[PDB]
Amino acid sequence: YRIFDTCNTVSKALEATLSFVAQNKIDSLNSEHIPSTIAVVGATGSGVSTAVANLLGLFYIPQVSYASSSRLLSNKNQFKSFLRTIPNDEHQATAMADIIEYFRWNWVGTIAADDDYGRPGIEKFREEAEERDICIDFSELISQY
């Protein structure tokens, strides 16, 4: 194994991935000491996993993530080598809508992270709430920055 820390940041993850794909990169771009990574386990963030998936599926290196659950990573046209051991977030937005329907609320607010995780999930929840006659007062986007 060769395991690097991403720090929940796309930059660190792409340096680590460039380390991962070094042999394939030099083969496709023109020393055997560089190891050949056969597959990658990661990453946590969905934007980080998106960048890493672009780079890895460029060389068809399988990438099995464990925490990234964005629905955008289910697009096999863009992400050919991406796999998930975590469920997609299509069902979690529907589950939140069902929770709001169960407790007989119709006036709610929404906050989401300004990344590939929060935005698709909150859009799916907005769709489900509109189907279930729930009025969303506000929709806000936040980030750690």
Partner: protein, 51 residues
């Protein structure tokens, strides 16, 4: 009492508008006052129709 529309504000936000004489509203969260049938008027509370 039926549901009246607040302009510029979504459907979940409504006003309570009392039903007029002749019409009534029997259920809650009703969007329309229903007229009592022929040979029938509405009681004081507009919750039912009496002959």
């Amino acid at each position: 009492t039926r549901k009246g529309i607040i302009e510029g504000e979504p459907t979940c936000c409504f006003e309570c508008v009392e039903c007029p004489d002749g019409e009534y509203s029997d259920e809650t969260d009703a969007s329309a006052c229903n007229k009592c049938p022929d040979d029938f008027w509405s009681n004081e509370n507009h919750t039912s129709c009496i002959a």
